[PDB]
Design a protein around this ligand. Structure first.
Ligand SMILES: Nc1ncnc2c1ncn2[C@@H]1O[C@H](COP(=O)(O)OP(=O)(O)O)[C@@H](O)[C@H]1O
Ligand SMILES: Nc1ncnc2c1ncn2[C@@H]1O[C@H](COP(=O)(O)OP(=O)(O)O)[C@@H](O)[C@H]1O
Ligand SMILES: CC(=O)N[C@H]1[C@@H](O)[C@H](O)[C@@H](COP(=O)(O)O)O[C@@H]1O
Ligand SMILES: CC(=O)N[C@H]1[C@@H](O)[C@H](O)[C@@H](COP(=O)(O)O)O[C@@H]1O
Ligand SMILES: [Zn+2]
Ligand SMILES: [Zn+2]
Lengths: 290, 290
């Protein structure tokens, strides 16, 4: 009835109790150097700050999540960490059941619970956050796949002539549209800035920042097209701090109406924010303990 | 128990009885001019050549198939035909039940019946034929989607700087890897030839034909990668006359091993050939009459 939720990410490693709402939120510095020891200690402190306060642990986590292990498809999103015994480290601190699930899959399970269930049977949530991640609901069932890969739509093809992605594959969507991909360009400018800063020189109509935010949305627009015509998607919410940025969804919708109408789809802002992973894992774990 | 199967395509409009094997095959000229009248008359003749010989009709057909209508996503694959009352025209000639299904979805349902069902739960068949088509089995269930679009993987993104596709979208996989896409290049040569001819100047190591068959496989290789990492696919058979061409699958497998191993997948030749659509529709219709 009472859940300890963790949203492990590249930037955000959240934690919260989910009674039926979020409460007692925390938000640690997801470590970017000495990360193997750093994540053991963070999982230790957070597990201590809540002992006896929960009946199960629900972990939404960046990376492929499979038999308790976190395999980082893109190690650049984890300070270099290729792998991590996620469930084990957590079990060193509590006896309660522990469910684990990719972070984007957890959000898509959250956002899907706000949808008219027989108007919308195929659904996709797209986070444009640190990287680019997704989860795929088909016939109301969240897809995870036999290895927990299903949903890793940020490493589908964006441009066969584009940047090498941190995963080793050329031209991924993540390598072109992600917060990381934006920052790789905006740091090397004569007038450097971080992603949030790119979004405001964008609104002031700086050529450079607009060309860069457009490159990202046009790629996300193409991702949605691929999704619509491959799986017959009926609605797409997009989350993440770049996705939820102001004026971005409009730029996606704009680039999406260059496509034959058949590729179009209803797109909405994620209605759960930085708390979609927590809430998703909390409900998704609970519903596969029944 | 006795089925009249039709495989409607861009080049091939087949027909056959499926008792439990194919028999009495036919193979008409899929008309490329005056096609609306042409397809009514072909559906008339074939329905007459078999009256009383079947208990139901099963139609595998190129195009989105939805409430009896064939909507051509790419009208160039149908001699211009944007739409066709497929089921209606067939009902003008028999009282028996009539099931309809996209052609690539029908093949993927065939080929999937030859698979170890709990070694392989996510499966994809890719036809590299006139165009590029697919069907997606997830958790042993063939995906069609609420509008029969699911599987139209030939109109996912291949190159955002490539040819406009006959569907209206820039850079589709079909526009780069299909038999049509090959022929559009090999006709305009100083020494023109058809696709089959491209595959033999290829084997004799003609620069031009190799550059062209490589462009197609490298794109199919990228499609498989997208499929593996999006949906956690476990095996992929590829059919169609370009797919089944000799030395092509090897070129796909070759370009696929440039990818991080996580993107790799077991790939096999389709083991049903020009009869996968017929057999697929025949079994798939029968199993959704129970
Ligand atoms: N308010 C914001 N506006 C635009 N970009 C942001 C904003 N906040 C964070 N970002 C960028 O988004 C990325 C982090 O996304 P976020 O969802 O917060 O992290 P996580 O991947 O852990 O879920 C970073 O690249 C960051 O620069
Ligand atoms: N033996 C072959 N070898 C190479 N290419 C072929 C061969 N036969 C047909 N093609 C080409 O494949 C395309 C037709 O594929 P096919 O599966 O026969 O038709 P359909 O789309 O109706 O199922 C055409 O472009 C044709 O040029
Ligand atoms: C470590 C890793 O390879 N993660 C991949 C996904 O599994 C993840 O869901 C996505 C978004 O995660 P986020 O950006 O941290 O929110 O980023 C990456 O593509
Ligand atoms: C008319 C039309 O838009 N058809 C599309 C698909 O539905 C079809 O399955 C695929 C392969 O069909 P084939 O090449 O005729 O075998 O080609 C096209 O992309
Ligand atoms: Zn990648
Ligand atoms: Zn197309």
């Amino acid at each position: 009835m009472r859940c300890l939720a963790l949203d492990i990410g590249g930037t955000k490693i959240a934690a919260a109790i989910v009674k039926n709402e979020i409460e007692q939120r925390q938000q640690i510095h997801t470590p970017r150097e000495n990360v193997v020891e750093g994540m053991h200690q963070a999982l230790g402190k957070l597990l201590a700050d809540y002992e006896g306060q929960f009946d199960y642990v629900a972990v939404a986590s960046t990376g492929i999540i499979n038999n308790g292990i976190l395999s980082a498809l893109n190690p650049k999103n984890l300070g270099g960490l290729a792998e991590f015994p996620l469930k084990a480290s957590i079990a060193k601190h509590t006896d309660k059941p522990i469910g684990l699930l990719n972070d984007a899959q957890a959000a898509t399970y959250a956002e899907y619970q706000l949808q008219n269930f027989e108007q919308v049977s195929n659904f996709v949530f797209i986070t444009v956050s640190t990287g680019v991640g997704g989860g795929i609901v088909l016939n109301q069932i969240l897809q995870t796949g036999s290895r927990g890969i299903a949903g890793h739509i940020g490493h589908t093809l964006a441009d066969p002539n584009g940047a090498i992605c941190g995963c080793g594959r050329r031209g991924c969507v993540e390598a072109i549209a992600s917060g990381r991909a934006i920052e790789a360009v905006s740091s090397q400018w004569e007038d450097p800035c971080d992603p949030k800063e790119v979004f405001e020189r964008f609104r002031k109509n700086d050529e450079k920042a607009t060309a860069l935010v457009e490159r990202s949305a046009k790629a996300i627009a193409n991702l949605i097209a691929d999704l619509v015509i491959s799986l017959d998607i009926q609605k797409i919410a997009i989350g993440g701090s770049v996705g939820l940025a102001e004026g971005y969804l409009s730029l996606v919708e704009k680039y999406l109406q260059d496509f034959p109408s058949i590729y179009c789809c209803e797109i909405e802002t994620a209605k759960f924010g930085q708390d979609a992973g927590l809430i998703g894992a909390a409900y998704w774990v609970k519903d596969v303990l029944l």
